[PDB]
Amino acid sequence: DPQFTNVSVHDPSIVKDGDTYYIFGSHIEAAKSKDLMNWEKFTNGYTTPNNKLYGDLSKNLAGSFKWAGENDADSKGGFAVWAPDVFWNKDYVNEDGTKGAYMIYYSVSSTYIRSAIGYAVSKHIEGPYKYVDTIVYSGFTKEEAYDANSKINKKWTNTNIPKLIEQGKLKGVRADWFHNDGSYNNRDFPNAIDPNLFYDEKGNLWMAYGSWSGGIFVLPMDKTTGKPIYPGKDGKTPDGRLVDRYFGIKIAGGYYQSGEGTYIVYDKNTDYYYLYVTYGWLGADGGYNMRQFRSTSPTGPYVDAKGQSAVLPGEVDNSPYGNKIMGNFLFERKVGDPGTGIGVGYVSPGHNSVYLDRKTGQQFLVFHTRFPQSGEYHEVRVHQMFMNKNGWPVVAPYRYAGEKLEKVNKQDVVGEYQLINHGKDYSADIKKQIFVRLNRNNTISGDATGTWRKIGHNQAEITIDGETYDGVFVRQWDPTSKRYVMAFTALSNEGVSIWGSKLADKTDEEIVEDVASDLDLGDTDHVVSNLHLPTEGTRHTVISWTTSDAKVVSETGVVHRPEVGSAPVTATLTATITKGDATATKVFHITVLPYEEAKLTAHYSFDNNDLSDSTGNFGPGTITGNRIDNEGGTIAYADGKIGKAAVLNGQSGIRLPDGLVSSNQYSVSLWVKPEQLTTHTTTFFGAKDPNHWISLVPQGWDGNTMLWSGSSPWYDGRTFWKIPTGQWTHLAFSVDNGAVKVYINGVEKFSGTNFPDVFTGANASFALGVNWWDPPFKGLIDELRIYEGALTPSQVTDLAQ
Template sequence: MHLSKKAKRHLLLGASAITVALVSVGLTSCSKPQAFKPSKWHTTMEKHPAIHDPSIVMVKDKSGKPHYYVFGTHVTEAESDDLVHWNVPFTTNYENPKKNIILGNFDKNLKVPFKWAGHNDADSAGGYAIWAPDVHYDKDYKWADGSKGAYLYYFANSSTWRRSVISVAASKSIKGPYTNVKPIVYSGFTKNDATDGSDRNIKYTKTNLPKLIKSGKVSGWSDKWNMPGGSEWNHFYAPNAIDPAVFTDAHGKTWMVYGSWSGGIFMLRINPKTGTAYYPGHDSKTKDGRIIDRYFGTKLLGGYHQSGEGPYIMYDKANKYYYLFITIGGLDYQGGYNIRMWRSKSPDGPYVDAKGQAAPSYKEATGSKINTKYGIKISGNYKLPGMDKSYKSCGHNSAIKTPNGQYFLVYHTRFSFDNNFQLRVHQMMMNKENWPVNLPFAYTDKKPSALAKNKIPGTYTFYNLGTQTSASDVARKEITLSENHLVTGGMTGKWKIEPKDSKTYYLTITSGKTKYNGVVTTQYDNEEKKSGWKIVLSAIGNYNETIWGFKDLK
């Protein structure tokens, strides 16, 4: 999450968690763990809680029924059985600083990362900066008493736009509390004594690098990390250590993808026994020429301070693709925040978009927003006809595939003239080319019925999300799908459908050189003043555009 100083407002919070070691005198020393007490969540129900940078996690109960959790920036969280009604255990950001349900007593449990960033320092002056967590269950995590299995809470602390640290904490319950905090990767450090935003010394000796170098896990200092002279961070090359997201690949290996603006998006292998990283150790390059840094890992895209943050990777076993989501643009309501998507057959890339372009790895500075040329744009600013305000800066998403095969995109949105934010969940469906297309309305728990193909022709409210990053809303137009399969109005061309299942059709629209592949289905519109069932279309074009359309189901 890339924020200006004005946008950063943090409150104090905390909680306590202490492990007591008992050593028997005169006998072989042994440890007796304190009995674990999971946090109790006292909740209220909300449909759209104020959760920024939401990361979704699914947990099955004893009967196999899925239960969903989201975790967000400022130590916010919620749970749901249906992805519509959310039980929310907080009323303010950083609630209950002395006994937080997730991270316990911040001053005690986060003492090590706070020495570097995120506590009453620079942009976090007067409070805390705890951002963009992601929770991952690790069955091989090893506790001090020898027991295995933990929920791991990956999170970032930040003091400036480049000085940050990603850490991991562990719990035996997804609801917390999380303890055993271990830093993984730092950013913003220098070779020499220096400062950044405060009087705090940012020399690399204050990070985990000296221990890693001494143990041989990292080969040594790299001059690439700093500008010439060794007293300023090289943000063109090296990442900002925030926005972690963790996933497991097809072979059972665990990875953490992370980064925001600065040197781009990187990834590291995760050690399942500790939740911390396997570092490359030496610099090298991927087969396609991307950076592999001895400490930061493999670069996926970005660099030279082009916008791009909130990375998330979803692996789909059905089609064996890894889907990479990145949000570009500025995060306030005027910043044009929007989600881009790529895919790969390998967890570490290269990732390509619908145009066949590899995700860009920049090699020089430029003042232009060249990143708008890459990635399928799947969100944007738009206003529904029956709403008083627009959706703005929809981004920093996570994604999930449920046990019944449904795909969902989870993100936060802002609104016209308003930097407040809310959680949104949209269903996605796979098109014929195995790209997930984002449906236009927020998900509801209403079950669609069969859709007769003779209902599909007609006039649709129409949006083309385009490829640009802009503060303006995308244009709202109308198109008509005629019975003789012509497209007229705001887009011209030809359309055809073929059955996907009893409730959905694959859709193809050809307009000039652009071919859009997507779906036609039904959704219940609960967002406009007049709610009701709609026939909706969503498709991705071979020039990275997403199109939406909808009309009343009669």
């Protein structure tokens, strides 16, 4: 039934104009939809001029760009226009003195603290938006100072503050804004990004903003002009939270801890201000997760279900604070569940907005998310939310598909559920389901015990291991099985959320039959890799294995490839599948391939005082400077492992020719003499483009030698081994249709499957010592050998010597 059209809009700020829903996100991306399911982008990103939102970007927002976000520090080469919020401001006095305009409040940033918020206006939601002013600034300093790769002076005199002191809106500079060395005190005070403009009960206008550092602040705003009404005077709220003459009132975060993407919604139905913030880091390993507080006042205090304050008491883990409404999750499609793929899950879902419909009461969490097994690729998602009995909106487990609350029969609730509990913790981990059933005697049994009730038409009360969770039952589109299913979502007074999705009713026999038809080990006629043999199917179905011949393949799928030139070798794996007294059997016919010798395709020895390929079928290399795409470094040839090695001083390396590798069956060998270790720094690299690359990393994100692929998907070829300096080490890795191996000094240190295919039918870029981001390799690398095919353990224990 339901159709979806996806868009990649990061940090979506939703707004309804007329009958159309609009989202505005970072990087000047935006889109629109009439149904919250099918999105159509209308922007052109950082294209300038004729930028959709801003026109000639550079001149329109120059005011803001004088301070950060244009070709400066972390924005070198481009722009950084982040996390906007957009609304129709009926009171805005236009420069022709007419009333009413669409405002866009945006952020610009150059480092993790040097940022500012400014706004622009339009007669029309799609723009053009013309700059008005820049109103809040962070990362400024007590004296003249510059950042690495920045010519912008960060002294506070270079912000709006002098003008504000001249206008009588501030008395002066606050000493507390500075550390003793004159640096920006981001322990106490904010990074000026991520604005959210909202209205209170009375129609007064507020802006909340912030991201990590000192946290989230809120300022009242002049409806007529778009400017803050700065407090003018330092102080403390009645309950003790920091007030600042300029930055406003602190409502969440603190002490460097995470927390950005604030969104605040006044709900007239409950008379609460609901505060959403996202903890953690946005990246696939970041554990981005959405949090929820409330207050009776726009300016707080904001607290969670447990009555705990959103404002941190000190430099502590923020895990306990805030209802955790969504983290990493997957409703795993185990063997025997209907559909294909791994099932529906999200990684790092967050930076949300919220649409609450004045008339109907329907409510929607809007956010961007990443996904398991796709790295940094992201899309916009929308989940409905539903007010529970205790005045907390609860998030639905599935993306919105037209559903609404109904009168729900006890009959349609009773049965087996997959259940996910989001807890409080957050990390790279992905929560997966357990199995329980909600029995007609209102008990709960299975992987957890307890009780449940439906109340009124559809309120849910689930009590598990002595924890009670209040929420709703609602029907939901499960895209894995492709049915509307009954579901539940419910929050406890700890502020922990559990989710439920009803499984199709099934006998033990039908399950085993399902597990049996669905059990597949892929193409097992060309096996070069260990086979993963599942020991479990859906709903705790158990699967055991035997092998006809352990010398070919073990019971756990461990393969033994025969000698080069030998015959492929055959065996049979038998799966026995049990649940209750139902049982079935299925056999699979394996053929394990012999090793095949990789053949040398190119050789950079550096032995003839140049970057020539000795095999004489690729061009010579060229020199780079400190990145794969820049020029002007120096290659000293100096005494090395065989002949002369290539030296790299620390500030360049070698651009190898395009297309060097052009397959998914290849191998790379080289000898490395490092002086210093720097994290992420490559030797051999790597890339189709800056999102699809391979890198042989002497010290990677885990502190060890690895083979690394990124950023969509991520691959962690971890050897768990650290490499020495002033010293030669032999490194080799092979790739063979997803099959990957890495060798440290001849010994195999990593072996895996599903290695990405980065170079087949592309003309990619390759280099030694340098990439697009990290410190160049410092030391020597000798004897770079590229191959077609996968080096044999034998070929490799010979290159090592």
